[model samples]
Target: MLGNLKPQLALMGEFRADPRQGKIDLGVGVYKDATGHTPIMRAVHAAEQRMLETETTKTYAGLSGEPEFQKAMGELILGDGLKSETTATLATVGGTGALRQALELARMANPDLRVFVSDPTWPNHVSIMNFMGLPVQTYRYFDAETRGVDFEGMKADLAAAKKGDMVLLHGCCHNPTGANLTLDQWAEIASILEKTGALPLIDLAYQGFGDGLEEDAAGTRLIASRIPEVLIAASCSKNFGIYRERTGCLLALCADAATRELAQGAMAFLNRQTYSFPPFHGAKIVSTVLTTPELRADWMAELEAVRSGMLRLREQLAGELRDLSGSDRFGFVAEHRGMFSRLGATPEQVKRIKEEFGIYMVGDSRINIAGLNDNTIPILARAIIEVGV
Candidate 1:
């Protein structure tokens, strides 16, 4: 027997079926160009072409996935912090798969592992954890008034996490809200983690999407260096533009080589019991893009453009709101980095924007920055003010 489906995705279907040609879609999380198309990144296309000519076999890959992919991703994310003897990695279907496997692995370590997540995290975080029967707790994160991090509330809640508990964090470009922790705040969180002795699970799905590539990783690196053990689930979907390819990597940084071995063995066992072997095509493309200098440079250039484009949209929207509202209340839109920004609008206001302006966004008013262009910025800003946002 099965239950009725949630209306989450049904909203997208309604948007698709809407016959309004001027409809602006700000609901979905995917990155879009000014022309409103999600194009294939140049380097990804190039890598696929090279593979088409040079590839030899389609044989089975190891349960842990291609070592080159693992190594490249590990180096890309961990930088100088990666240690061959202390890190266990597994390729996953996507960031979601990585999180699932990471949670299961944590449960193996401690069956009663309680999971702590941000109050308004990616909905799937609580959904997946709950489906797995884990005790899920929400720490206050976004401040409704300012539309920024509720640091004091977050700290108090996280401070309550006990030893053996696992706290999930968004490494960068926090989903839905787009608000992120500062490096100093990250240090504070690390200190709290040290005192609590809780484990940290970081979901890094938007590397290179916020700030610069290296700058975006500063917090993650600091946390990894401060904590004795950390779990990082990284996705190549946003950075590499291989969303459909389902390429993600899970890195378990252990306290010692002995623990590393156990983690690796268990990750492999989980892979065997679940999907057997991770998909290799996307992994291979990522490895090729990172290792080959010319391809790597091209990928970085395109990624930078994407990052800057989103930033520009953020500024435009915020500036427009500021001019119209005659106040800085909406300034958080520019302060928030990444592909998303939670407008902090009421559900009724969100409906008004959709019904009156045909600007589609999540019920929570989370809009994809990439979904905007110069043409729609003024229109959105006008609609926002008229609706009393």
Candidate 2:
């Protein structure tokens, strides 16, 4: 799919290979420390060490894969009440695997189920939908004027969906553009889903990273509780810092036990046909941390720390921009949550930032706020002003 490399990425690759210090890399999606390094969470590290010591065999986890992990994830994402009603879960390679499998399941149910995605969603979402031959439509999401969700336009577009159509939503923190919808908007969305019988497929890649852990799952939980059928693809890559382990889960909620059983069978069959079994290490780590009370609390605490760190960076960046630009228009940076925030600048401005300041960001003007620190925020803010944003 990558016909020609993204210019920003080409420069980033060249910069990485060079022996240079003080160069900032914001083009990536992962959470980074002040030094721009992605660190392993303490809970994840401990869980891995414990698993290594106690694990007996490297045998396959079967088609449904890690049951304990699935159960924990269900409870974690949907809460207790909805988890009881939730139908089935399948382990997948990662969020992408879950997404692909979700699409496959939808296609199986209805051959012509078109998916509606956000306008500036993570690039992979569109690419994957195209690969699956699923019809795709874009609903207005990011409003550059406010650097927030365009709820009015989103509602209008989603209302156009017919029955059996899938509306892909960012469960918590939105990728690429960190702008998110309010709880009221989510409630309205649930109402719309109910009215149209349009299935809501939530791509939950950053749950704990935005708001708080439980709070972030509020929207997904609301939908799961209200809807008879829903699809959720959750990733542990960001929250658990288990990117390499490729841990994720695909959950389907059905109207009744019979439908649930059928969906479960389909999910297992999909796993069998695709990769046979999902990876074990990341799921095991997640289960280890979640199943145990103390570990779960510890992980939550660490996650809060990470969330607070990003919030601090956001505030710093917004404050710096306000000071430099002499306008509060850029204050939306602080309002946005999660790892990224679109600068609302043109592609040329984004390019100029990289070329003039060695400050890399996606061409869509999306910046990984986690990629910046107190030291770099001022530099970046200065660059934005210099580039005439």
Candidate 3:
């Protein structure tokens, strides 16, 4: 899977051990603060403490996993209208498990079904699909010139999809590129899916990390409402700050209760074939946070603060760039939402930033905005300007 990977590991090991103060790490996928730490939510800690007191047994949750957690997660992602006949959920190890299970379900239904992903999606999506021996294709996503979604190219590609093909979409806060489609674009995509009979599989790893909670869910909600069948893989790792707990849910929305039941059975069969049952602690923690009114509110508030903080950093970076470059071309950084924004620099520039300034970002020039602060944004902006980008 990782052939020709020695140089990559050596570079990563050096970065891992680097002790330079003010060194920025934008290579990792997880949300981080200016200090480069992924802080746990207070609500999550509270939920864990409560679980310690109220939970009595450490028994295994069944193949379908915890019902309360599943229900809460379903409501949180799909909203109220679709809860009755529109759902089948299975707790998974994390968003990755949910994604794998969704792929497995598709393979079971039609082994020939292909998985379509964005051109530069989360790297793991392509790797996992390849590992499963599933054929994959990429639709145009990021437009390097605009530093945004290539809607025309995306539409053209998706319009060509055959029935039974699954298009994996980032529910919100698109990874790596940080570019996202507008609501109108999502509706258009839905129309294409309906016309083509293509199933839309949404990977919602950072729901609350984008706009407000409901706003972040706008795309998924729109697709789920319009499509006859929708697959959602939701993660609590970002929103709930439960990365290590492996908390996530895989949801399949069918046409009716009967279809939902069948989907549920298929999900269980997939889980049985894979890991048998999912982990409980993360699900329990997520359930505790979502079901409890106060805790849920608290979690949303904290998420909003994180979102706003990242936005502020993006704005600061863009403003600094405008001043440094004597042009407004880089203002797209502020318009882009989520934890990351592609700096749109060449690989040589990205490498130079790391080697000379200790400012580490992905090879593709995507930087985690959450990885910056007032102190470091100026340094990065100076580096970009100095590099003559």
Candidate 4:
């Protein structure tokens, strides 16, 4: 037995077991509204209803997944200038599955490939790479003083990656820490990857959370256009409000049609070796919702509201904290985008907040912004100040 699972899951265990009254949980990564509930998107509900009526089978899609689903996901991530002729995609269990298969595919091509990850990346990235026996290096990302990206440090660290290595990048709404790189920074990163010949692996789990769907994919598109090879693992869980649906895709961009066919075959083979075929319901739901003009409009409208709501929460929390502290130091909370923002609080302070305030956040002080509703905002703010954060 290898022993207990990841520390993040371990923290989740503690959160789930706590029975304190009105305890605000800022732990999990799921998107939540002001009511702290993860509501089903209208489009998803409508699509499922349509599927229930129209679907004739409860069968699996092909090993590479339903072509329609693949095509739709490709389009969703690549707004324009889509290189359909040179791109190959496989529908996976979820974003994690896509990442695992991408790694396997990469290792199949180059067995000695090590991945460069952000210093404070999604813990699962490092966990999965370690499980796959891949050497994981890190690039500096967050700046504690500014509570933002340390672009200079990131560039210097990425410069060390050798040719053919992989550098994992969060496509948007960076996990754990909400700090993000701008389009100009993405351009700079493309230059670095081009110079190093290091393959770019983009994890696009929160595409619509930071900015709009199109705006968020700008980096991935730029990198794809700049290089012949790229790996993208995208998830529909967050935006579609279908976390349990396990909908996601892995896309490999090759130089030409011949390479695309080869990549496609390899991806299908990898899927066969793993799950054989991917589940169809989630993909079909996404495909239907996206393909149908009315449903897509509704979905986009709902997604925009969710995006706007999280931004408001961020602003409110930052403003509240600033008012309480009488300083601009806490302004980064508002500046940070997404469901998470690392408070950069010490472990001791994090423990005290949990013990005394009934507010539960990760030990690393990474609080889920979506976890806090309007009422709980003040609760959390007072607790942060109480703990001298």
Candidate 5:
């Protein structure tokens, strides 16, 4: 039963095995440049070099990980809402690990915790919860007509959440579907959670991959300020181009100092139980890059370049589709911010695109914008029409 559980992996395997020279894979969610390569950022390389030069022993960090890394990450994610007195944080293997620890902590606090997730969220969210034996429910999110967030439907579904329920929110650059909640919409969500007394677990995996670093985290900061208790899972993979390093942090904002202390200890225990100590090198690199002014500025500049590059590709794809389809149906591509956009195509259309064009996307028609370039955008646009999408 567990043999063929991952659809994306199967598709990725198929894509790899294909001998076609023109094969393009939009299946995996990784940042790729126009030349079809994921390059390490200049600042990341510099940080690695600096680490090599610096004299230090290869020793295990604390159970909760490095304090400098935690502090830097807290400021980066929470902005003005970060209160050290009331916040508990832990380092994890990656964003996925942070999410796992968050779920574990949530379950420990409330045994009757049912998790509410977006209908078309990243598939791994459901996979992780199901594996943990946690009851999961879906809230309506992406609308096929608009190819955007269905805010009203989402509110209606969230209204059913009990006090102890946990609501998982994508802080920015929502996975699979690039549709994200506006800051105004985030305010309303905070109000909803306030009334329902449900806790929010924010997954901020692509912080600098969207509009801008500050703009991307605005919604998360707003939620943290308004909510009494919040959990944030942040990743440095996309922004720092450190996917293999598996750098991520989990922050828990408690209602009071006492609760914060308890949560902190529990988070450390979770880390101890899982990996004993979190991976330190990635965290060190992140902290080093962030703390050094010159490296930080360079990292920001490079990140901005990547963000704008993806944005241009998005616009180009949308323009191509509009010209090809002779309609505004594909306009959502330009509006979506992130590495992916759900094309709202049928499974048949998705299959046809792969078979006919050697262009592989997820079964749900979620295409990675990063997978496209100046040359492939037109090809993909033509394929979308030819496949009757």
Candidate 6:
């Protein structure tokens, strides 16, 4: 049997084959520093050293997962509202693992579940849902003209999802788009979900990468409080710098303790049918850093630096484009928060940038903000101008 080519993997293959010096890669989602390196966070390194020295057992962490990792990650995402009484969490292979399991569990609960997602969402959302034979619908989201959220259109489209249906939302950083909703907008969406009786499924991949750690979780928290049932899939790959470790957890917040306990049993049973037990190394690293005060503080400090550096890069890019074009039309580069910004470039324009200038971005013009350093920003700017973007 032959597997079909994926867009992202296909792009990566082309990128590797192209033998160009001074080539810039802006397609992938991984965070790179100004030096073009994805370094392990200091806290992660420290946690590993501590674990290697102090920990002895390498046994299984059970089908559910390490209780310590689950508790810490739950607190990190839900904050003070993380209620042990009504919450059940499971560690998984990665964020995708959590997504897959959440969809599986939701479908088990509602056999007729059809997923509603934002138009131009993380392509995998639709991909996985469809693979599972779930009907999928898209709602209006990014406004091409404004380069921001089309709130009214989004709300209008989401109005159609039936009660008990799953509505997938980006909890923060809104991958590929970088546009985020205000707290007020989140509150409004919460109202819409309430009205439609759609259960909210939040993908929180880049929590600390957007605002501060707590700030990024604001929308997720608001939705959790407003809705009786919520599902959250959180990833540690970005924030904890554990990309290859495949660390993530799926949290199912139910209506009561009995419901929570029952949900927990289902998750464990699902794991037994699949991986049997989730990966433990990344979760241990995550828990070690989160529970220790010193390591936690250090991680936060380093995370803050990463966040502020991206902000500075975005500002510089926006300023350069404004000056070059003699208009603020591209000012959304700065206004759009997170690690990505849609340049609104046409397909021909994107292809031109890669062929002519050795710059690579997605065909839809989504550029990873972390890909641009101070040195490459000007090069990308000139390429944008040359390509008529």
Candidate lDDT values, in order:
0.93, 0.88, 0.88, 0.90, 0.92, 0.91
Best by TM-score: 1
Better of 4 and 5 by TM-score: 5
- In the order shown, the candidates' Cα RMSDs to the true structure are 1.9, 3.0, 2.7, 2.3, 2.4, 2.1
Task: Compute the lDDT of residue 146 as modeled in candidate 3.
Answer: 92
Name model 3 segments beyond 4 Å from true.
1-9, 16-22
TM-score of 6: 0.96
What is the C-alpha lDDT profile of model 4 across 127-163, one tens digit per residue?
A: 9998889999999999877889999999999999999
The C-alpha stretches of model 5 lying farther than 4 A from their native spots are: 1-8
- Of 2 and 6, the candidate ranking higher by TM-score: 6
Task: Give the RMSD in angstroms, all C-alphas superposed, for model 3.
Answer: 2.7
- TM for every model, in the order presented, reads 0.97, 0.95, 0.95, 0.96, 0.96, 0.96
Among residues 3 or more apart in sequence or in different chains, the pairs in candidate 3 whose N, CA or C atoms overlap within 3 Å are none
Candidate 1 lDDT over residue span 6-98, tens digit each = 754889888989898899889978998877789999999999999999989898878899989999999999899888789999999988899
Query: Candidate 1: deviation at residue 32, Å?
Result: 0.5
Worst 10 residues of 5 by lDDT: 55-64
> Could you tell me how far off, in angstroms, the CA of residue 176 lies in candidate 4 after the best superposition?
0.9
Query: Of 2 and 4, which scores higher on lDDT?
Result: 4
The positional error of residue 135 in candidate 2, measured at the CA in angstroms, is 0.6
Query: Mind giving the per-residue lDDT tens digits that candidate 3 earns over 168-255?
Result: 9999888988899899999999999999999999999988777888888888999988887989999888888889988889999898
- In terms of lDDT, the poorest run of 10 residues in model 6 is 1-10
Compared with the true structure, model 1 gives a TM-score of 0.97
